[PDB]
Amino acid sequence: SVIVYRNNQSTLTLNGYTFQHLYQGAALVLTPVNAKTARTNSINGGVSISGRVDGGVHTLAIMVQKHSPDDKFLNDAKNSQEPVVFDGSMKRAYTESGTLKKATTTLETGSITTQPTKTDNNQDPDDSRTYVIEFRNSVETF
């Protein structure tokens, strides 16, 4: 179709704090970690189709600016004495065939899994922090 976005990277909200500072590039990467439906093949020939209970668990990878308040928020979450639960949404406003529309991806029950790999380079600095949160259930709709 004819799809024209606005605000190139989708607006991410967690715990009522919306990320106003994303790195250039792969700012948000919502990878589903497990296959949706696992299937098994029988001797006679039939197949047993069965939804994985892990079917929804996603990892949202976030590239925030090296020290911008978004990095402060995610770093404070990382440094908490007990793991903090994130429950937010990725909202993207776009137009289809000229009609304004919104796509909503709710993220439920996440925590920081893989901590950012902090690098300070001289020849070519990489001023990014990649926090990977693993939400229990992410549902997209539109």
Binding site for another protein (CB under 8 A): 40-43
Q: Name the residue nearer to another protein (CB basis): 43 or 53.
A: 43
Give the helix ranges, DSSP H, for 37-121: 69-78
SS3 42: coil
Phi, psi of 71 (to 5 degrees): -65, -35
- Residue 28 and residue 61 in contact, taking contact as beta carbons nearer than 8 Å: yes
Minimum distance, C-beta of residue 50 to another protein, in the bound complex (Å):
15
Q: Name the residue nearer to another protein (CB basis): 41 or 117.
A: 41
Minimum distance, C-beta of residue 51 to another protein, in the bound complex (Å):
20
Minimum distance, C-beta of residue 53 to another protein, in the bound complex (Å):
22
Compute the distance between CA of residue 112 and CA of residue 65 in angstroms, rounded to an integer.
17
What letter does residue 22 receive in the DSSP assignment? B
Q: Name the residue nearer to another protein (CB basis): 44 or 141.
A: 44
